[PDB]
Amino acid sequence: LGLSITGLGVQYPPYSLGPDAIDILSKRYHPESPAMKKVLAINRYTGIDQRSSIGNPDHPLVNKPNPPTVKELHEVFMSDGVPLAVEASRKAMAEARLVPAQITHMVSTTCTDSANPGYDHYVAKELGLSDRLEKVLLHGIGCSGGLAALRTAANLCLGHTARGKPARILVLALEVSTTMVRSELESIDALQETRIGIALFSDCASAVILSNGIGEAPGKPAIYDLLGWENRVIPDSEHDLGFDVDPMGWKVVLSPRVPVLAKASLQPTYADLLSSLQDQLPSSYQKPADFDWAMHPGGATILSGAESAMGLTPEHMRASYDRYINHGNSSSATIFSVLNRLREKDMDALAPGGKVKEYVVGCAFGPGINVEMCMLKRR
Amino acid sequence: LGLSITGLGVQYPPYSLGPDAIDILSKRYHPESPAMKKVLAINRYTGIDQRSSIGNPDHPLVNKPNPPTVKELHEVFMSDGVPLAVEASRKAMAEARLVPAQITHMVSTTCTDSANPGYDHYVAKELGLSDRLEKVLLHGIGCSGGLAALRTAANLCLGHTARGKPARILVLALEVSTTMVRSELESIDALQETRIGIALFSDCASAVILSNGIGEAPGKPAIYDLLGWENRVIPDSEHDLGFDVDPMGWKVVLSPRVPVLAKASLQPTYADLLSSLQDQLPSSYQKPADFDWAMHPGGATILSGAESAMGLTPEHMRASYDRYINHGNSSSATIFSVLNRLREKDMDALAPGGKVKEYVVGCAFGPGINVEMCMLKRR
C-alpha cells in the first residue's frame, strides 16, 4: 500500500490532576451526597495516578458560580487546547522532516469542541500550511477518533496514490475534557447518579504524519508501516456510550454493558484484520500474543478485558498502561500518544519475554459503539 | 478519474415560511427596537419568497419561555431532521440503483448539530447500511459543506480505485437552521446588532451517490461526471464568517466584508480549476459564460456578484435562483438541491440561449472563508 507513519508528536499540557482534584472541587461546589461519595470512591481505584490537564483545580474557568457554558469552554479550547495541537503537529512534522508546503491533507478530530471555522483551521494557519490544504475535521466519534482519523487519512493517501501524487497527511487529535468537571459534578449531585467520567478523562493533543510513499526522501525512513485496518459498528449500542451536546458542554453517556461489548469484539475484529493480510505476515505473527498491542485505554477494565479475551499479559499493552496510569484517558488523542511511547527505549525494556515485536495491533472503541483496529509494522 | 454522480436526492421539510413568519415570532417575544426593525426590514430585501422549515411559527420548540438550549435543539434535529436525511439518501440510492450492502463509504456534513454518535450513524442505521461502512462526519465548515463532502468523497473513491475496489459513496448534507430563530432574535434584541441570519436560513437534506466506476457494467448511466475540483482559504477572513457554539445552539458570525471577499475569489479560483482540466474540455467550453453555474446561493449579493465578476446572466445560475427564491439558504444542503434541480426539464427551458450546457461549474463559500469549486460533465 506504500503507507507509512513518518513522524509522531505528542503534547500534554503541563498540569497533572491527582485523585484529590475532584475531591477539592466537589466539596467546594456541592454538599456531601451518597452519589458523590460513590464517585469519589471509584475515583480511587481507576488505576490512574494522574490526569493531564490544561489547569489545576483553582483554574478560573471551573471556579465560577456556575459551570462554564459551552461557549466559555470553546474559548479555553482555543486559548489552551489549540497551542497543544500546534506543538504536537510541529513535533510530528519535524520527525517526518517536512516543511509546511509538503503537507497535502489534514485529518483532525475532537469531541470536546464545536466551532466554525473548526479548530483545524487555526492549527493549520499557525503552522503556515497551504491555503490549498485539503482538510477533514471529524465529528461524532469520541474515543475512536484517533484510529478513525488514521484510517481516513490512509484512504485519502491512496486517493493521491491513484493520481500518482505525493501525499503527506497531518493526522491530528486534540481533546480538552477536564474543563467539563463542573458539568459532571452538577449532574452527579442533581441526578444522584454515579458518573465516572471525571475520574477518567484528561487533556492531550497528538499527531502523526501519514505518507503515501510517493516522492519520499528516498531510502525513506518511517517509524511504522500501515499494513491494514478494520472498522465496525456494534448494532443497538448507541445508548451504551455517548457524549451529548448540552448548554454546559457535552454529557458523558456510559452503560454497564460497555466493558463486555468491547471485550467480546476483539476476537472477530482481530480475525477479520488478520484474514485480510495473512500472506503478508510471517508465521511468527499469527496469534494475539505474538503482537505488541497499542490499545486505547478507555478504562482499567478495557485493558484487563483485552488480557483475558486475547490471552495477553499487561506488558503486551505496556504503552497503553504507561499513558493510562500517568496521564489518564485523553479520548481521541491517547492512541497516538501510546504509539509514540511504544517505540521509546524504556518501553522496549518492558517487552514480554524481552521480545520487542515487529508488528503492532492498534485498537480503540468509542461512541457508536465504533470499533477500530489497525495493523502496523514497526521499523 | 472514473468518478460519477449516479444518483441525487433532496428532501425539504413540510413547511414553507413567508417573510411574515419571523415578524410573528419577533412580535411575540420582543418589543420593537432599532436593530429588530432593521432586521425585519432586511428580511424583505433578500428576494427570498419562502424558506423551508421543519415547523411553522407555532412549533413548541420556538415557543418556550427562553430560546431552546442546544440539547433541546439536538432533540428536534434528531426527530425532524434525520428523517429528511434518510429520505434524501433513499432517493439518491434509488436513482443510482444501489441496495444498502453496496454502499462502501458515507461522507456527511452538518453545522446545526453536535452529537456522539453523530447523526450519520442514525441515518445509516435507518438505511440498513453495512456494519463495516466507513463514515466521515465533517464539522467546522458550514455552507461549503456540500462541495467539501463531495471533494472528500472523490478522494476516498480514488483511494479504493488505487486498490482496484468498487466505491459507492453516500454523500449527505442535513441542516436544520430555522429552530435557532429564538436565539437569533434574542441576540438582535439584547445586543442591538443587525443579525440577518433569520432572513436567510432554511432547513433541508440532500444527498448524492458518488461512484468510482469500478464494478459498474460498461455503458452504466450517470447524471454527472466529476472531473476536477479546487479548494482555497481566503487569508485573514476567519472573523468575517462563522457559527459559534453557544448554550442556545450556534450564533451566526457575518461581516459586511463577505460578499466583497467572495466576489473577489471567483475569477482566480475558476482560472485554476479550468487550467487544471482545460485539455479535457472542447473549444466551446473555454470562458465562464460557456458553462452552467451551480452556485450556492449564500445571499442575493452572491448571485448578482457572480454575474458581475464572471460576466454571467441569471439564467446561467437558474437552478441557484430557483432554490434561493423558493427555499432560501439551506447551508450545506443547498448545493446538491441546486444540482438536482438543474437537471430537471423546466430548468432546461431556461438555459441561456437555449443551450443546456454539457459542463457545470459548482461553487460554494463558507466559514474560513473556505471556497469550493468543482467541474462536472453533464451526461
UniProtKB/TrEMBL annotation, chains A, B:
The modification Cysteine sulfinic acid (-SO2H) is found at C143. SUPFAM superfamilies: Thiolase-like. The keyword Transferase applies. GO terms for molecular function: acyltransferase activity, transferring groups other than amino-acyl groups. Residues 58-211 form the Chalcone/stilbene synthase N-terminal domain. The keyword Heme does not apply. It holds the Pfam family Chal_sti_synt_C. Keywords: Acyltransferase, Transferase. InterPro entries: Chalcone/stilbene_synt_C, Chalcone/stilbene_synt_N, Polyketide_synthase_type-III, Thiolase-like. Residues 232-377 form the Chalcone/stilbene synthase C-terminal domain. This is Chalcone synthase. The lineage of its organism: Eukaryota, Fungi, Dikarya, Ascomycota, Pezizomycotina. The gene is csy.
